[PDB]
Design a protein around this ligand. Structure first.
Ligand SMILES: [K+]
Ligand SMILES: [K+]
Ligand SMILES: [K+]
Ligand SMILES: [K+]
Ligand SMILES: [Zn+2]
Ligand SMILES: [Zn+2]
Lengths: 613, 138, 385, 393
C-alpha cells in the first residue's frame, strides 16, 4: 500500500436497512390463515395504507383486529411487532395536582402581595439585631396570579441562526470544561504520586487515601477518570486506586497525560469547523424582519390563504349578524388606488419578467402582455395611449379587440367583475404588489434626504456601483428590482444595498422577483382555462357598455355562473371610477349577486326579476 | 511511494498551538503584576531619592520595609516564567523536527528552495574570474 | 411626559473621578451548575481576562474578599436553609427528598459539586465591597460574582440560592440613612423587593419586562405596603425596546427619584440578559445603550455598588462588563480585542461590540407616556430623606 | 510644508544633564590608508588634544574599550569576508587577487598595515558604548573612531571595511523595541539602510545629497520593502545648502519622527564631509549649523550614541567634534584655541570656527516643500497600535 495515496470511501449504509429475512416467513402463515384472496387483498390494502402514513397505529391494529383477532398467538405476535402496547386502562381517575395553591389565600393588598397567616411558625434567624429585625419584614409575600394579561400580543421567537450560534457556544463550553477538569485532576494526582515515589517499600504497601483526596469538590476526579476509561470499567479502577494508591496511580496518571494532549488537539481540529461555520451564520442573524417575512410570505401568498382571509371576514360578519347588534354587512375587502403611475411601474417589471423567461413561446408572450395591458387599461379606466407613452418614454430615458387578444342603470360610475378563483387570485396579486410599492414610495422624498444627509463601512457597494446617489430613490428601487429580475444582481447584494442605503424599512421588497413570478404564470393560466375566457368575455361585454338595467345585471351573473360549476364559488369585484375604490364581496351561489337593499322596494324589484325567469 | 506531506501538516498543528499556550501564562503574569503597582512606584521613588540625597535613617527603614513587603511576588514571576519556558521548549522541539522532516522530504522542492543553476546574471563573475585565472596561466 | 430623543454617544465626565475597588476570586470559575444548564460562572472568569489585557488594573485595586460565614448568611436567610445548603450534595440527594421540596432545591436550581463555595464567594465579595464603601476607602465597589436577586428568605428561585444583595444593602444601611436599588435586569427583582417591601430606608426601582414572563411579579401598582408605600417602583416594558427608547424611559425616572427621594447610596444590578442576542431575554439594547445607564448613575456622585447578575450568552456579557469597567475609571476602551486566551469565543470579527438586530419594537409612545406620568403621579410623597 | 527662517545662536538648555562616557584608544591615530588617500584617522587624535587642553575631560569619563572579536564581527558580516580582512596584508596581496576582486578591494578601499586592528577598535568602541547604554550607566556615549556606515555585509565600500553601527544597533536592540538612526553625512547612509530595510525595529533617516554623487542610492521613493515599508526616510538635497535652510529642513522631520515612531534609543552619525571647505562634500554648513543638529537630537532626552563618520579636512572635523562634545556637556566653549601639540593646521587666526563660503544654494522653497510633504505623508503609517502599553519610551 506504499505507492498509492488514501481515499475516503463513499459511506457505510446504516444497519436498519439490511436486516429483514427472518420475519418474511410469518406473512405466509398469515396468508394461509386468512385463506381467501379478497380479504387478504384488503388486508394488504390497509397495510400499504399505513406504510404511506395515512392512518394511525392503534387504528391499524383495530383494522387487523377485524381480520386476525380470530387467532390469539398471531395477534399477539403482530401486536408486539408494531409495538402496540396494551392500553390496559378503563379504570383511570384523573387525579388532582399536588401544588398550585393548596394553602395560601388571605387578606391581599395590591395586585401581587398577600399577608402571611398569623401563626407561630416562627423560624428564628441568627444574625439579626434590632435594625435588621425592623427594616427586613416577613408579613407579606408575593405570589404570581397571571391575571389575564388584560391585553394581547404575540411572543418573540428565535431566528433560525441564533439557535445555531447558541448550540456552538454550548459545544465549545463543554469541550473547555472537560479539558480544564482533566488538567486539575492531573495536578492532584501528580502531588500524590510525588508523595508516593520517595518512600520505603513497606510504607507503600499499607498506604490508603480517603475519598476526596483533598479536593473540596472531589467528584470531578472520579468523573474525569470515568470518562477516560468508561462507565463500565471505570468504577473498578476508581476503587483499585482507592485501595492500592502505590502501584495503580502511576498508570492512571500516565493516561490522563495522553488524554489531555489528545483532547486539546481535538478541540483545535474542530475549532476549524466552528470558525468556518460562524462567518456565514452571524451576520444573517441580525436581520430578523427580512428573514421572518421572507418565509412568512413565501408560504402565505398562496391560493388557500387569501380565500381563507376573505371568508373569515365573511363568517364573522354573518355571525355578528346573527347577533342583533349590527344590521348587516355590505362588502368584505376594500382597496384604494390613489397613485396610478405605479400601474405602469408594475408593467416596468411585469413583462420585464417575460423578456427573460424561457417557459413560454414569444407569440403567447405577446398575447399575455396584451392581456395585462388591455386588462389594466379597461378595468382601471386609464387610456391605453397613456400606457403606450409611458412604455415609450420609459425605454427613452432608460435608453385591437381583446377577445382575440385572448383568442335602469344610467350614469354608469360603478362596474362589477363577477369572477371565479383564478381571476381573484391574479387580481389580488396585482393589488398586493401595488400597495407595497405605493407604501415604499410615499416616503421616498425623505429617503433621498436620508441618503444625502448621510455624509462620510461596506466598501463593496462602492466598487460594485450599488450605492445610492442623491438620485430619485424610488426610481432607483425600480431600477434595482429590474436588475435582479433580469439577473443583473444576485440576491444578497440587492439585500444589503437596500438595507443600509434606504433603511431596514424596505424588507417588503426583498422578494419582489418571486411575487412577479406569481402574476406571469396566473395570467398565462387565465388564457388557458377556457371558462375564465368566457368570464372575461362576458365582463368586457358588460363593461364596454355605458347603460343597462339591473335585470341584465342578474342576467350577467346568471350566465357567468353558467361557466363555473355548483361547487365553485364567486367573488364580485366592484370598482367605482371616481375614487378608484375597489371593493370585493364573497358571494354564495343562490343568494343575491349585488349590493344589499337600501330600501325594500328595490328588492321588491329584485324579487319579481329573480323569480320571473 | 507517495507523499502525504506530514511535515507541513504537523507544522500547521504546531503553529496553531503556539499562541494558545503563551496567553494563559501572560495573563498569569498580568495577575501577579496587579499587586505590585502601589509598591514598585514609591519604591523606585524612595530609592532614587536616597541615592541622590537624621531622616535618612527613617528613609532606609522605609526602603527595607517596602523591599521585604514586595519580596514574595518576585518568586511567583520566575516560577511562572520557568514553566512557560519549559512548555515553549517542548513546542519548539516539535516544530523543529516537523520542519527538518519537511525539508528532508520534498514537501518543499529543492529547486524552489536553493534556487536555479546559472541564473541569467553571474556572467560578470565568470568573466572576471576567467580573466584572473587566464592571466594567472599567462 | 415621555419625549423621544436620539442616542448621542458615550462621554466620560472628567469633572468626577473615583477610586474603584474590584473584587474577584480565581476559583469561582471552576463550579459548573451542570451540563446544559444556562447559568455559567465561566462568564465572570471571561470578563476578568479582558480586564487583565486592557491594563485596567493600573487604575483600580483588585481584592479578594473573605468568603462570608454562616452567621452573616443568617442575617437574611433562615438557619434551616443554610444548614441544608451546607449539607446537601449530589452524592446524598435522596436522603433529603423531604426538605429538598420545601426549599425548591432540585427542580430548576440543581445541586452541583461545591455550590456552597460559590454562594460564600458571592456573599463575601458583596459584603466586603459594602463594608469598604462605608469606611471611606473607595467610591465604587465592583463585584461581578454577586447579583443573585431571585433568592428568597427561605427558598431558592432562578438559580439564586443566596441573596447577597440584601446582605450588602443591610450593610450599607448601618452607615447611610437611605439607599436606592436599581435593577436593569430583564427579569423582575423579586427577591430584593420582597425583602425590603414595607420599609422606607430602601427604595427599589426595577426595569423589567412584564406579561407572561418569569417570575410573574412586578406590576405597575405594586408600590409596597404600609410604611414603604410609594417606596417601590416597577417599570414594565415590552419586547424589542432599544437604546433611544430605553434611555428616554430610564434617565427621567432615575433623575426624578434622585431629586425627590434623596438617596445616600445606590446599588446597580447590571444583568446582561437585556442585551441583543441573549438566550433567555427579548430586549434589544446594545453595548453602549447598556453602559449608558451605569454612566448616568455614576454622574450623580454618591457611593455606588455595581453587582453582576443574569446574562446567558457568555461573550456578550463579558464584553459589556469589561466596557463598563473601563468607563468606571473615566476611560473609553479601544474597540479591538487584545489576544487573551478566550479569544476564539469572540468570532468572527473579534471586536468590542454588541450589535442590535432589526427586531420589531412594541413600546409605543402612548404606553410609555401613561406609565411614566402615573409613576411621577404616585412619586409625590417621596420627598423627605 | 516648509517655511525658511533665520539661524538662531546654538544654546544648551539646563533642565537636563547627561553622564557622558567618552571612548578613546591611543592606538587609533596610528593607522594610515596610504600616500594620498583622503581618509586620515589622525584627526580623531587631534580632536582628543583639544578635549584635553580645553579642560573638557573634567566632566566626563574617558575609557578604552576592548577590541571586538571575530565572532562579534560575524554577527553581520560573512565568514569569508571577515577571514579575508584578518588574513590580508599589504605584502601578500598577490595571493588574494580573487578575493580582492570579489570583496571590492583595491582602489577606493585599499589594504594597509593594521586594517584588522583599526576595525577592531571601531567595532569595540561602538559595541561597548551600546552595552554601557543598556546597563543604565551613561546617557550619551561618544565614539569618534566609529561610523563607517558605507560597508556591506560582504563587501568593502567607500573607505569603510566594517559596519560598526550595525553591531552597535544589534546590541541596542536586545533591550529596546525601537531604535532610530540619524545620518547627517553628505553621502547616503546605505550600509545601515540596506541592513535594516525589511524590518520595523530600526528606522533609518538620511539627509544626503542626491545627484551625480556617491553612492548613488537613497531616493525620495525608496521607503522600505516588506514589513519595513515606510521605515526608511530619505531627504535628498542639492548643493550649497546652508545653516538656516538645513535647520528648517532638519528640525521638523526629526520632530515628526519622534512624535510618530516614538523610538527610545537614538544613534547619531556626525560625519564631517558636510562642512564648508571639505574636499569631497558640497554643502555650505558652518560649525554652529552642523552642531545644532546634535543639540536638537539631544534636547529630546533619550539614550543617544554619537559616532564619527566622514570629514576629510582634518582641522574642521577636529574643531566641530570638540565643539559638539563640549555641547553634550552643557558647555559652550570659547573661540580662541588653547595651545596644543597641533597649533598648526589652524591657520590663519587659530580659533574655534568653521567658515562658510559664498557659493550658491541650489535648493528652493518648492523642491523642499514637495520633499517634506511626501515624507510627512510616508511617515504616518509607522505608529504603534492603540492597545500596546509602553514604558514612556
Ligand atoms: K430589572
Ligand atoms: K422599598
Ligand atoms: K547622510
Ligand atoms: K528599517
Ligand atoms: Zn434575568
Ligand atoms: Zn560621507
Amino acid at each position: 500500500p506504499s505507492i498509492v495515496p488514501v481515499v475516503p470511501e463513499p459511506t457505510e449504509p446504516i444497519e436498519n436497512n439490511i436486516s429483514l429475512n427472518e420475519e418474511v416467513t410469518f406473512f405466509e402463515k398469515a396468508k394461509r390463515y386468512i385463506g381467501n384472496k379478497h380479504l387478504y387483498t384488503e388486508f394488504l390494502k390497509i397495510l400499504n395504507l399505513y406504510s404511506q402514513d395515512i392512518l394511525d397505529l392503534d387504528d391499524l391494529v383495530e383494522k387487523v383486529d377485524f381480520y386476525l383477532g380470530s387467532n390469539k398467538e398471531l395477534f399477539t405476535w403482530f401486536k408486539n411487532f408494531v409495538g402496540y402496547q396494551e392500553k390496559t386502562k378503563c379504570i383511570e381517575n384523573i387525579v388532582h395536582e399536588k401544588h398550585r395553591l393548596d394553602l395560601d389565600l388571605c387578606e391581599a393588598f395590591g395586585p401581587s402581595y398577600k399577608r402571611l397567616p398569623k401563626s407561630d411558625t416562627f423560624m428564628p434567624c441568627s444574625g439579626r439585631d434590632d435594625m435588621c429585625w425592623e427594616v427586613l419584614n416577613d408579613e407579606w409575600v408575593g405570589h404570581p396570579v397571571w391575571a389575564s394579561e388584560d391585553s394581547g400580543f404575540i411572543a418573540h421567537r428565535k431566528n433560525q441562526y441564533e439557535e445555531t450560534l447558541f448550540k456552538i457556544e454550548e459545544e465549545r463550553h463543554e469541550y473547555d470544561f472537560y479539558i480544564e477538569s482533566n488538567l486539575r485532576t492531573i495536578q492532584c494526582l501528580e502531588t500524590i504520586v510525588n508523595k508516593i515515589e520517595n518512600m520505603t517499600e513497606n510504607e507503600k504497601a499499607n498506604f490508603k487515601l480517603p475519598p476526596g483526596l483533598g479536593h473540596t469538590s472531589m467528584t470531578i476526579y472520579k468523573k474525569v477518570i470515568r470518562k477516560v476509561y468508561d462507565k463500565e470499567r471505570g468504577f473498578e479502577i476508581i476503587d483499585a486506586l482507592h485501595e492500592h494508591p502505590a502501584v495503580t496511580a502511576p498508570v492512571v496518571l500516565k493516561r490522563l497525560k495522553q488524554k489531555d494532549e489528545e483532547w486539546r488537539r481535538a478541540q483545535r481540529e474542530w475549532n476549524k469547523v466552528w470558525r468556518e461555520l460562524e462567518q456565514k451564520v452571524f451576520f444573517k442573524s441580525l436581520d430578523h424582519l427580512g428573514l421572518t417575512f421572507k418565509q412568512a410570505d413565501k408560504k402565505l401568498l398562496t391560493t388557500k390563504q387569501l380565500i381563507s382571509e376573505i371568508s373569515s371576514i365573511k363568517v364573522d360578519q354573518t355571525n355578528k349578524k346573527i347577533h342583533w347588534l349590527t344590521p348587516k354587512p355590505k362588502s368584505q375587502l376594500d382597496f384604494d388606488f390613489p397613485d396610478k403611475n405605479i400601474f405602469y411601474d408594475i408593467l416596468c417589471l411585469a413583462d420585464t419578467f417575460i423578456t427573460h423567461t424561457t417557459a413560454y413561446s414569444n407569440p403567447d408572450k405577446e398575447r399575455l402582455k396584451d392581456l395585462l395591458k388591455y386588462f389594466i387599461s379597461l378595468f382601471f379606466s386609464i387610456s391605453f395611449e397613456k400606457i403606450e407613452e409611458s412604455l415609450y418614454s420609459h425605454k427613452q430615458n432608460v435608453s385591437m379587440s381583446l377577445l382575440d387578444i385572448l383568442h335602469i342603470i344610467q350614469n354608469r360610475s360603478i362596474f362589477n367583475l363577477f369572477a371565479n378563483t383564478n381571476i381573484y387570485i391574479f387580481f389580488r396579486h396585482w393589488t398586493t404588489i401595488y400597495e407595497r410599492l405605493l407604501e415604499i414610495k410615499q416616503m421616498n422624498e425623505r429617503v433621498t434626504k436620508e441618503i444625502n444627509t448621510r455624509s462620510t463601512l461596506s466598501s463593496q457597494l462602492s466598487e460594485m456601483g450599488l450605492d445610492f446617489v442623491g438620485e430619485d430613490a424610488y426610481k432607483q428601487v425600480l431600477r434595482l428590482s429590474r436588475r435582479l429580475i433580469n439577473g443583473d444582481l444576485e440576491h444578497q447584494w440587492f439585500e444589503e444595498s437596500l438595507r443600509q442605503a434606504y433603511n431596514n424599512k424596505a424588507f417588503k421588497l426583498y422578494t419582489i422577483d418571486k411575487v412577479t413570478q406569481s402574476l406571469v404564470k396566473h395570467a398565462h393560466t387565465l388564457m388557458t382555462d377556457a371558462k375564465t375566457a368566457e368570464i372575461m368575455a362576458l365582463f368586457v361585454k358588460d363593461r364596454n357598455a355605458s347603460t343597462t338595467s339591473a335585470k341584465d345585471q342578474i342576467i350577467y351573473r346568471l350566465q357567468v355562473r353558467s361557466h363555473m360549476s355548483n361547487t365553485e364559488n364567486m367573488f364580485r369585484i366592484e370598482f367605482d371610477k371616481r375614487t378608484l375604490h375597489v371593493s370585493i364581496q364573497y358571494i354564495a351561489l343562490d343568494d343575491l349577486t349585488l349590493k344589499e337593499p337600501k330600501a325594500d322596494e328595490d328588492k321588491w324589484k329584485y324579487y319579481v326579476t329573480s323569480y320571473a325567469l | 511511494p507517495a507523499n502525504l506531506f506530514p511535515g507541513l501538516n504537523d507544522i500547521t498543528d504546531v503553529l496553531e498551538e503556539f499562541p494558545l499556550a503563551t496567553s494563559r501564562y501572560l495573563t498569569l503574569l498580568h495577575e501577579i503584576d496587579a499587586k505590585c503597582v502601589h509598591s514598585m512606584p514609591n519604591l523606585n521613588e524612595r530609592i532614587d531619592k536616597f541615592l541622590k540625597k537624621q531622616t535618612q535613617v527613617r528613609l532606609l527603614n522605609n526602603i527595607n520595609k517596602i523591599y521585604e513587603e514586595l519580596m514574595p511576588s518576585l518568586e511567583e514571576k520566575m516560577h511562572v516564567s520557568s514553566i512557560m519556558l519549559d512548555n515553549l521548549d517542548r513546542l519548539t522541539s516539535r516544530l523543529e523536527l516537523a520542519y527538518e522532516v519537511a525539508i528532508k522530504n520534498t514537501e518543499i522542492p529543492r529547486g524552489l528552495r536553493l534556487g536555479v543553476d546559472n541564473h541569467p546574471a553571474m556572467h560578470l563573475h565568470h568573466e572576471l574570474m576567467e580573466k584572473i585565472e587566464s592571466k594567472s596561466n599567462s | 411626559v415621555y419625549e423621544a430623543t436620539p442616542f448621542d454617544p458615550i462621554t466620560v465626565k472628567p469633572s468626577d473621578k473615583r477610586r474603584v475597588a474590584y473584587f474577584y476570586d480565581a476559583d469561582v470559575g471552576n463550579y459548573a451548575y451542570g451540563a446544559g444548564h444556562p447559568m455559567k460562572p465561566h462568564r465572570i472568569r471571561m470578563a476578568h481576562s479582558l480586564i487583565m489585557n486592557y491594563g485596567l488594573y493600573k487604575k483600580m485595586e483588585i481584592y479578594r474578599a473573605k468568603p462570608a460565614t454562616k452567621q452573616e448568611m443568617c442575617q437574611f436567610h433562615t438557619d434551616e436553609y443554610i444548614d441544608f445548603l451546607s449539607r446537601v450534595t449530589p452524592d446524598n440527594l435522596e436522603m433529603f427528598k423531604r426538605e429538598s421540596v420545601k426549599f425548591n432545591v432540585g427542580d430548576d436550581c440543581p445541586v452541583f459539586d461545591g455550590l456552597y463555595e460559590y454562594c460564600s464567594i458571592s456573599g463575601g465579595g458583596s459584603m466586603e465591597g459594602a463594608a469598604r464603601l462605608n469606611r471611606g476607602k473607595c467610591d465604587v465597589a465592583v463585584n461581578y460574582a454577586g447579583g443573585l436577586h431571585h433568592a428568597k428568605k427561605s427558598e431558592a428561585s432562578g438559580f439564586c440560592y443566596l441573596n447577597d444583595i440584601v446582605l450588602g444593602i443591610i450593610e450599607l444601611l448601618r452607615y447611610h440613612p437611605r439607599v436606592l436599588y436599581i435593577d436593569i435586569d430583564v427579569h423582575h427583582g423579586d427577591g430584593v423587593e420582597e425583602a425590603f417591601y414595607t420599609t422606607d430606608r430602601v427604595m427599589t426601582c426595577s426595569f423589567h419586562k412584564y406579561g407572561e414572563f418569569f417570575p410573574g411579579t412586578g406590576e405597575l401598582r405594586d408600590i409596597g405596603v404600609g410604611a414603604g408605600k410609594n417606596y417601590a417602583v416597577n417599570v414594565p416594558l415590552r419586547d424589542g425596546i432599544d437604546d433611544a427608547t430605553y434611555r428616554s424611559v430610564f434617565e427621567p425616572v432615575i433623575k426624578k427619584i434622585m431629586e425627590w427621594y434623596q438617596p445616600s447610596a445606590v446599588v446597580l444590578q447590571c444583568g446582561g440578559d437585556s442585551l441583543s442576542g441573549d438566550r433567555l431575554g427579548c430586549f434589544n439594547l446594545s453595548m453602549e445603550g447598556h453602559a449608558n445607564c451605569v454612566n448616568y448613575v455614576k454622574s450623580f456622585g454618591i457611593p455606588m455598588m455595581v453587582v453582576g447578575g443574569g446574562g446567558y450568552t457568555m461573550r456578550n456579557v463579558a464584553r459589556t462588563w469589561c466596557f463598563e469597567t473601563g468607563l468606571l475609571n473615566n476611560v473609553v476602551l479601544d474597540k479591538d480585542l487584545p489576544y487573551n486566551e478566550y479569544y476564539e469565543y469572540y468570532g468572527p470579527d473579534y471586536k468590542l461590540s454588541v450589535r442590535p438586530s432589526n427586531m420589531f419594537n412594541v413600546n409605543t409612545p402612548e404606553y410609555l407616556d401613561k406609565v411614566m406620568t402615573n409613576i411621577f403621579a404616585n412619586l409625590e410623597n417621596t420627598k423627605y430623606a
